[PDB]
């Protein structure tokens, strides 16, 4: 590892998330100071683009959209809100505000651009929302009530090319994009979710191996890999990898990667899927690699 930049992010209070754009040209950061702060970071510089104040509580996650839709950012808060923000002519204003949750919204994640411009959001009431851009400023909103018991903590989408799921298609038709996502919660469950032929959303599969509240869950990008893979982390300090080795079997295997001395907070996949980052309760990140023997090895200690 080597440092490029050491951004002085002007936040007065605890930072909860730090995410770049699809190209690594910009940085967004959110905090207990009711702000999301956007920077230019090109060539190791720093320039503040915006102090996006306009949540009323602590902000718990940020997510950039795919550049195919233009310069769009989402963020979620303790105040029950999800706000969507956009850069047009070079200025930032609010482009949606969704308050349709019954407690703190702890996570947000965008769909693969192949599904359309769709956002997912997970809430402390136990629900999940999906927000689909319909056109001309408008949004459809679906609310999966009671998606987790006790509370919902994290949401992450499946990549739009599921491995193997193309073999039966004769040349000249479109792929039938089977929209899916994963979510974690205070019921100790990870759950997999799918859209059905009526446009309703359904609990497809459960993943049960943590002995404590699941903090986070992330799906691996299907770049080069012929398997479908997920990481998830917990309040008992575990990290599990989960493989699905046949997309027609829909069958998943839990592989313990590590168990730390305290909580694990977040799990984050490399843009080439081959490496995992893991945020530890002793304020550290650790970095993890799959070998050709399929074993998970640390690269930070």
């Amino acid at each position: 590892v080597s440092v490029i930049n050491t951004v002085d992010t002007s936040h007065e209070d605890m930072i909860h998330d730090a995410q770049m754009d699809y190209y690594g040209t910009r940085l967004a950061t959110c905090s207990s100071d009711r702000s999301v702060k956007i920077f230019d970071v090109r060539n190791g510089g720093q320039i503040l683009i915006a102090d996006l104040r306009g949540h009323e509580g602590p902000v718990w996650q940020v997510a950039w959209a795919h550049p195919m839709y233009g310069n769009i950012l989402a963020s979620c808060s303790y105040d029950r809100k999800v706000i969507i923000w956009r850069e047009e002519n070079g200025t930032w204003e609010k482009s949606h505000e969704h308050a349709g949750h019954d407690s703190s919204v702890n996570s947000v994640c965008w769909a693969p651009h192949d599904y359309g411009l769709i956002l997912a959001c997970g809430s402390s009431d136990g629900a999940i929302s999906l927000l689909t851009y319909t056109g001309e400023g408008q949004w459809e909103v679906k609310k999966i009530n009671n998606a987790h018991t006790i509370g919902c903590n994290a949401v992450s989408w499946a990549p739009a090319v599921v491995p193997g799921s193309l073999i039966d298609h004769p040349s000249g038709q479109k792929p039938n994009y089977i929209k899916r996502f994963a979510s974690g919660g205070c019921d100790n469950l990870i759950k997999l979710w799918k859209e059905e032929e009526d446009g309703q959303w359904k609990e497809e599969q459960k993943l049960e191996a943590h002995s404590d509240w699941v903090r986070d869950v992330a799906w691996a990008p299907s770049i080069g890999l012929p398997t479908s893979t997920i990481a998830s982390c917990s309040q008992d300090g575990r990290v599990f990898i989960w493989t699905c080795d046949d997309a027609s079997s829909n069958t998943w295997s839990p592989k313990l990667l590590h168990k730390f001395n305290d909580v694990v907070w977040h799990v984050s996949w490399s843009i080439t899927a081959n490496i995992l980052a893991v945020s530890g309760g002793d304020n550290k990140v650790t970095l993890w690699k799959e070998s050709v023997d399929g074993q998970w090895v640390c690269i930070s200690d």
Binding site: I15, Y23, I150, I223, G224, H266, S268, D282
Partner: protein, 673 residues
């Protein structure tokens, strides 16, 4: 005050309280998240790796003039030894079935093995590719035979070549060992030479030391089995007679080596282990030269060596374990790791196993830990697999190929060789994964600034790798949306052949400013390539927009030409018909801005003046005065029915009326003469 730091976690009032769900500042008020970026970049907020770092996963400390050649030369070798197939929407790259690549790599590493600071890794790659030259490459001995070379001759030349490699892997340590031992003990120096097969130098040093009947004994040991059996008896006799214990243990070690005895048991109950203190290569070389006949295989020497370093029920261990060159000398007695059921070994040992057994493992062979002190260096791992795949080894898993190709493509993205990350991802047999992996990567790395470096990578990808150029410009259009340039968005969307997106952008952002600056010949460059019937019959609203701007330009061009050449009445009939076709169509343009409304009115003032010059060339004077044709002699009767349709403001239209009353009053002042 000054602000204080974030209080370290063991002094937080939140310490241990992460389960107190009713207070969100206990449940999440000390949590954080982290974000990856391209080139293996990370955004962070922890204790060491308020603030955020930007970080990179990167291999070594940047000599770009040196580091890059250890990727680029192997890649410009492999790109000679695969075929590119173009029968799918995304091309496929497939190995050339054969042997040549082993020599391309072996002679490249022979050049590279000198001055370069990666010298430990480059010399281990030299051992691996000269082992591939010893085990599957040929160009010299077998290749002299004008007949199909029998398996027996192949097995023998493979042993003759490996019976060079096991000396070349030993010489520099023998030459240091001899430089030290020669002046203190010539017996250890003679033994060191013999452990590298240097029997000529061992005999020479024994004639130099005063050990002439040792030199004579050594000089004959290159064939006759009788001397191996005569020393076997002589050692049995010296032991039984208790005369061994008056001979040097160092000299008894030479006699045991020559007699083909890996361990000897003395009358003192001392044991002399002949392989003691040695490295793993000279240990295997003793099995190949001294413990076997000339007529044995590599696979029997390798198995007798594996029979020498493992636990049995009936023998002590006498050989060392095969380990990667970065773990040799370390003193590491690997203490039987209580998770790691597969003990680590050298890539050179795994290749010797794959030569001894065609169904031996490929996973532990291609894993970087067998090659280097770095779990991120797939440089040799991928180039070994894309030689084994060419040698028709096929028992790797598709997850393991996927992890190899994705890890090496990520190693190539991270240190900036993203065009070669595409070359690796183009060896993905699965078309649906291959197209998405290449288009997703292109969508990150294609720039709006068409630099010499972007142009070199774009020409490499299109002219070597056959990557469809449509996706380079799909990527540049997705980049042009993020960096707001709607000229480069229009142009890169047009470089992706969807007409209606280019046209309905041109008519709103490019047409009006181009007309306002008389930059016609530029606006024409978009419009005449949209105009062909196989494109324009797909364009919405074309005939009232793009065709109106373009017929206006082509009317100006056809007058720009008639103002320079002796053109015919047939061409001026055409020009009058083209102008008359244009008046009640500038009438019909969808003008969204005041610029568009000004472009429309200056096009109209230009057309009203074009119509006069076209008509005074239809009404030239009689042949009695050598004067130029007057645009003010044009009949009112042919002007007014078309000017009375042109979208012109008062400041344009009342001037047209002063020009029309000037020609009307001339139709009267030449009606009364």
């Amino acid at each position: 005050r000054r602000q204080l730091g974030l209080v370290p976690r063991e002094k937080s009032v939140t310490y241990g309280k992460g389960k107190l769900l009713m207070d969100m500042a206990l449940f999440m008020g000390r949590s954080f998240r982290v974000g990856w970026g391209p080139n293996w970049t990370l955004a962070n907020s922890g204790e060491q790796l308020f603030k955020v770092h930007l970080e990179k996963l990167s291999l070594r400390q940047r000599k770009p003039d040196e580091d890059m050649k250890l990727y680029q030369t192997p890649l410009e070798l492999k790109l000679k030894h695969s075929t590119v197939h173009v029968d799918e929407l995304c091309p496929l790259i497939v190995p050339n079935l054969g042997v040549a690549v082993i020599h391309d790599y072996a002679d490249w590493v022979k050049e590279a093995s000198g001055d370069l600071p990666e010298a430990q890794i480059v010399k281990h790659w030299s051992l691996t590719w000269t082992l591939c030259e010893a085990l599957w490459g040929h160009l010299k001995e077998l290749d002299s035979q004008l007949n199909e070379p029998r398996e027996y001759i192949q097995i023998l030349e493979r042993r003759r070549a490996f019976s060079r490699w096991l000396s070349c892997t030993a010489t520099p340590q023998i030459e240091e060992e001899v430089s030290l031992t020669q002046k203190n003990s010539p017996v250890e120096a003679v033994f060191s030479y013999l452990t590298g097969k240097r029997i000529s130098e061992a005999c020479s040093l024994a004639q130099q030391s005063g050990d002439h009947r040792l030199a004579l004994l050594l000089s004959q040991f290159v064939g006759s089995q009788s001397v191996r059996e005569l020393l076997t008896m002589q050692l049995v006799d010296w032991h039984q007679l208790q005369a061994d214990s008056f001979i040097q243990d160092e000299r008894l070690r030479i006699f045991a080596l020559l007699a083909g005895k890996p361990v000897w048991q003395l009358s003192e109950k001392k044991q002399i282990n002949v392989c003691s203190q040695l490295d793993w290569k000279r240990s295997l070389a003793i099995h190949l030269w001294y413990l076997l006949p000339p007529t044995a295989s590599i696979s029997r020497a390798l198995s007798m060596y594996e029979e020498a370093f493992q636990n049995t029920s009936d023998s002590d261990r006498y050989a060392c374990s095969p380990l990667p060159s970065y773990l040799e000398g370390s003193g590491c007695v690997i203490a039987e790791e209580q998770n790691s059921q597969t003990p680590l070994r050298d890539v050179c040992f795994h290749l010797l196993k794959l030569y001894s057994d065609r169904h031996y493992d490929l996973n532990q062979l291609l894993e970087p830990r067998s090659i280097t002190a770095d779990p991120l260096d797939y440089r040799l791992s991928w180039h070994l697999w894309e030689v084994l795949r060419a040698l028709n080894y096929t028992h790797l898993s598709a997850q393991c190929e996927g992890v190899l190709q994705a890890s090496y493509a990520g190693q190539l993205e991270s240190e900036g060789l993203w065009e070669w990350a595409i070359f690796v991802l183009l060896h993905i047999d699965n078309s649906g994964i291959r197209e998405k992996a290449v288009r997703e990567l292109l969508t990150r790395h294609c720039q709006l600034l068409e630099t010499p470096e972007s142009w070199a990578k774009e020409t490499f990808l299109t002219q070597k790798l056959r990557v469809p150029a449509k996706w380079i410009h799909e990527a540049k259009a997705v980049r042009a949306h993020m960096e707001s340039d709607k000229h480069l968005e229009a142009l890169c969307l047009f470089k992706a052949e969807h007409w209606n997106r280019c046209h309905k952008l041109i008519i709103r952002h490019l047409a009006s400013d181009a007309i306002i600056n008389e930059n016609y010949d530029y606006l024409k460059g978009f419009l005449e390539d949209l105009a062909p019937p196989e494109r324009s019959s797909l364009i919405q609203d074309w005939e009232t927009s793009g065709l109106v701007y373009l017929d206006y330009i082509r009317v100006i061009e056809m007058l720009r030409h008639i103002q320079q050449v002796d053109c015919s009445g047939n061409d001026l009939e055409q020009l009058h018909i083209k102008v008359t076709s244009l008046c009640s169509r500038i009438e019909q343009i969808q003008c969204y801005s005041a610029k568009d409304r000004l472009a429309q009115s200056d096009m109209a003032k230009r057309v009203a003046n074009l119509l006069r010059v076209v008509l005074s060339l239809h009404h030239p004077p009689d042949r009695t005065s050598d004067s130029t044709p007057d645009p003010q002699r044009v009949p009112l009767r042919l002007l007014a029915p078309h000017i009375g349709r042109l979208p012109m403001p008062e400041d344009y239209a009342m001037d047209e009326l002063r020009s029309l009353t000037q020609s009307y009053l001339r139709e009267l002042a030449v009606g009364s003469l």
